[model samples]
Target chain A: RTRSIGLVIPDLENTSYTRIANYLERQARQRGYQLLIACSEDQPDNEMRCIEHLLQRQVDAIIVSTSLPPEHPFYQRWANDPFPIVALDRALDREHFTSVVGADQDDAEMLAEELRKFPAETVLYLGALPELSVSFLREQGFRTAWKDDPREVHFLYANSYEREAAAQLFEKWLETHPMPQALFTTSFALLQGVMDVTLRRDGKLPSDLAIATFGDNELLDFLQCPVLAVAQRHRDVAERVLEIVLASLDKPKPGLTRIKRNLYRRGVLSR
Target chain B: GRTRSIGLVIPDLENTSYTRIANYLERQARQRGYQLLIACSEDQPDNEMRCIEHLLQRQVDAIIVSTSLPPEHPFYQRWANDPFPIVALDRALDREHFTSVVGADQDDAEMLAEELRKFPAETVLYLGALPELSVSFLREQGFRTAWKDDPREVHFLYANSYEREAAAQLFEKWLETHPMPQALFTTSFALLQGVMDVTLRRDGKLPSDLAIATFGDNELLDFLQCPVLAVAQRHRDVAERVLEIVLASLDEPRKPKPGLTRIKRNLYRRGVLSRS
Candidate 1:
C-alpha cells in the first residue's frame, strides 16, 4: 500500500507557499510517500475541513500552513488531538502536530521591535490581519516592543491593504492621525500601497517615520533605512516539513510540533 | 527497467492558479506509478524553452505543459516532433503541435459577456490578462461582440493576467478617473478579487453598486460578500477524458491519435445571470 501524506496551505496561489508545497511533494516521493495537497483559502472552517478530509483519508502525516487563529476552534482541537502534523509558516495549537518546520515566525515581533527602535510617533499595521496566527503573533510582538515600559500601543488597522484601499486608508488616516515616526506592516501588498502613497506624497515617507515589515521588496530596495524583512525559507522549510512526514511513517510520533517561520533582518546602508 | 517519470512544465510555477493545475498533475502522476518533475519559466521565452530542454534531457516518459512556449519557438518544433506524447493544459496548440490536450475553452468568453449584460449595467469593463494570450484574445473577442448592440456603454482594459495588486491599483486609478462601472466582466478569478478589494474600500458591495462575473469555478466565490453573477463551468469529465487520452497515448506512443478533441464548455447558471 502506498503511504500518503497530506499537505495543506493557506492559499495555493501564493508563490512562496506553492514553492514550499512543490519542494515537499518532490521530497516526499523521494522518501517513499504520496502527497495529497489542498488549500484552506484563508478560512477557518474551510481549513478545518481540509485537514479533516485528509485525516479521514488516513494520510500517514499532514503538513499544514494554517490560517486559523490561535483561539479558533480548529487550533484548540489541534492542541488536544494526537496526530503527526508538521506545521509550516504559521503557528498552530501546539499539541496536534508532532513538529513544525518554517521560517522564524517570531520575525514579525522582531520586525516590530526594530520598528520601535526609531519610534514612529504613531504607526499603522495593514493587510489581511489574520486574527490569530500570523496577525495575532505579529501584533503581540509589535505591542510588546511599542510599550513605553507600560503604555498602550496606538496603531491603525487598515484591514486589507489591496493597493488602492491601502492608499485611501493611509490618506484618510493622514488627515486625522499625526505623522508617525514609522509604519509597520506585514504584507508586501500593503507595502506597495504605502509606496504608492509615498510617491504621491512628494516622494517622502514622513520624516522620522521609518517603514518596516515581515515582507521583502522586489521593486524598491530602500537603501540605508529600516526595512526589516522576514525572508521566506521555502527551500529549508519544505525539506524540513517533508522530513518530519517521512519520519512519521516510520516511528509514528503523535503530537503537535511548532516550527519557527524564517526571518531575515537587512539594515539599510547608512547614507 | 527505466524508472517511470512524467515531465510537468508550468508557464510559471510562481502563479498559484497554474500551481493548482501542477498540483493536480502531481497528484495524478503519483497515483499512476509515475514520478513528476515540475519546472517553472517565470513567463520568460528562453526560460520556458530551457525548462523543456532540461526535462527532455531527463528523458521523461511523457510531458504535461500548462502554458507552452510560443509557436515559432524552437521548443515547440521539438515537442511537436517528439515521439513521446505531450499533453497540453490551459493553452491549446495547433494539432500539429501535440498528440492530445485538456483545456478550458476560452472561446466561450461570449457566455461570460452575455451573462454580464444581463445585469443591465451602464458600463461593462473587461478585466483581462496579457492581451496576447489565447484566453485574453478569445475573451476580448466575445466581450466586444457582446457590447456591440448593448444599450449601456462598455469599457475594457488588460491586466497582466489578473495580478491582484496591480489590478487593484489600476481599478482604483480608473475609479478615480471614470465613474464606477455598473458591471464588471472579468476573465479570471483573480480579477474578481481585485474588484472585490476595490469595491469594499469604497464602502461598496457586489451586485449593488457594481455587478461582477468572472471565469472559473473558484471555491472562494461562494463566501464572497455578494454572489457573483455567474461562472463558466469547467468540465471535470472533459478533464478526465483528456487525461485518459493522454495516458493511453503514453501507453502506446507509436501511433497518432489523429482527430482533434474539442469539449463544449458549460455555463454555470448561478445567481442573477443564470438565464443570460
Candidate 2:
C-alpha cells in the first residue's frame, strides 16, 4: 500500500486551511504516511503546477485544496491518471477528483442562522473570490438563516482579502449607507478591514450593530465584543480529510463531494 | 560562556506572530547556551505587568519583551529604574529603562501605506497595532501624510494587536452594500488574520479588489496571497542582534543599558495602482 500522501494545500497563510493540512499531516504521519506538502498560493496556474510537481515526485496519493477550473491542463492530466486524488476545503468536479473533504458550508449557514440572535437588517459578507467553494457555501448558509428571506443580505468583494481594502470599501459605504444593524464576515483578514474603517470612524464597535463572522481568533476575546464566528473545526476536519485521502488509496472514487464545515459564531442577532 | 537563563515576556502564545517569536527565542537562544522562561501577557496591561514582574523576580540574566505596556507604566517603571540588563524586543517603552533592543522600521510601514496608495484603492485603511503603541501612531501619521493632499478618500483602522474576529466582523458590516475596496495596509502579521477573514468572505481574489502590504512577520508573508508590498523584516535580525546585546548586558550592574537598534526589511511589489 502507498504509505505516503502528497498534499497540495491551496494557501498556507489562511491558518484555517493550513491548520487542516497540518492536522491531516499529523494523522497521516501517525499512520506511517509521510506527508509531502506544497502550497498553491491561491492561483489556478500555480495550483495545477503544484499538482504536476507533486505527481512528478511519485506521491502515493494526492489531496488538493483549490477551486481551479476543471479545464486546467493539470486537472485534465489528473483526470487521466490513476493516482488516488482527494480534494480538501474546496471541491472539484467528479470528472477529475477521487474524493472531497471540507468544512461544511452548511455549518456556515447554521453559523449565519446563529446570527439571528442579534439585530441585523442588512448583513454584509466579506469574502474571497466569489467563485471559490467556501465563500459560496457560507453565503448559501447565511441566507438559510436570514429572517428576511430571499434577499436579506448584501454581498461585497474585498478582492485581495486585505484589511485595507475592506476599510476602503467600508469607508465608501459609511459615506452613504447607514451602518447595517449587523454584519456577517467570513475570513479573519477582511474582518480587520471592516474594523479599521469602522473603529477609526465610529470610535467603537457598532455596539448597536451586531456581528457574526465565519472565523475565530484571540482578538475576539480582547475587544470584549464576542463576534459570533462560524469557525473551522480544524482538528476534526484535518483528521477526516486525511482519513479520506488514506481511504481513497484503497478505493479511489473519482468525483467531488461535500464535507461538513463546522461554524463558530461570536455575536447575537439582537445585540 | 556558561549557560544562562533569559526571561522572555511575550504578548500572546495563541497568536502566530508571538508564537513564532517565542519559538525563535527558544530555538535560537538555546543554541547560544541560553534557556528561556516564556510568559504570555495576552496584551493586557495587567498581565504584561505581572509577567514582567515575575520574570524580573525570577532573576534571569537578561529579559526580552513583546509588551504593550508603556515604559512609563508603573509596572515597567519598577524595572526601568532598576540596574538590570533588559531588552524590549519589538516595541520600545523608554530608552531610559530599557537597556538594548530591536524594533520594526516605523517609516517603512508608512511608506508601505504610501506605496499601496499608488494602487486603485478607493480608501486606504490602517490596521494598526495597539492604540497606545508608537507603531500605531507612526503608521497613522504616515498614512495621513501620504493621503493628506490626495483627492481620493483614505481611512484608518486600529487593532489592539492582531485580533482577527473583531476586524472581520467590523469589515463584514462595512462591506454590506459597499463597493469592493481597492487596497489595505496592516502593521503586524496578525492583521493578516482580519484581512483574510473579511476578504475571503467577500468572494474576491487577492490584489484584484484589494492590495496588501505591511511590516514585520516573515512566516506569513511568503504564504499569504496578497503581495506584501513593503515589509520591515525584524525577526531574525532582532533575534541575532538582541542575542548579541543580551550577552553584552551580562556584566552591567546598575546603569540603564539602552541599546536602541533598528533593522531593515524589504518591501514587496512596489508601486502598483492595479493588480495584474
What TM-score, computed on C-alpha atoms, does each candidate reach?
0.54, 0.50
lDDT of 2 by residue, B186-276 (tens): 7765565676666644553344356776665443243233445756555555677777777766754544346466665566653221122
Model 1 over residues A33-97: C-alpha lDDT tens digits?
55666666677776777777676666677787777654566555445444567677665554445
Worst 10 residues of 1 chain B by lDDT: B218-227
Give one digit per residue, the lDDT tens place, for model 1 in B63-105.
Answer: 7665555534555666566666677665655566564354334
Off by over 4 Å in 2: A103-105, A120-134, A147-160, A265-271, B1-276
B234 in model 1: Cα distance from truth in Å? 3.3
Q: Model 2, residue A172: displacement in angstroms?
A: 1.1
Per-residue lDDT of candidate 2, residues A1-271 (tens digit): 3355767765444566556654664466456565555555577776666666556656788777765755555556556665677777566667657555554467767777766766566667667677765578777777777757554566777667667777788778767667876677777677777776665564456557666665675345324244666556778777666767666666655665555655444333212
> Which ranges of candidate 1 are over 4 A from the true structure?
A1-19, A23-98, A101-236, A239-257, A260-271, B12-20, B100-107, B132-134, B160-162, B204-207, B230-235, B258-260, B269-276
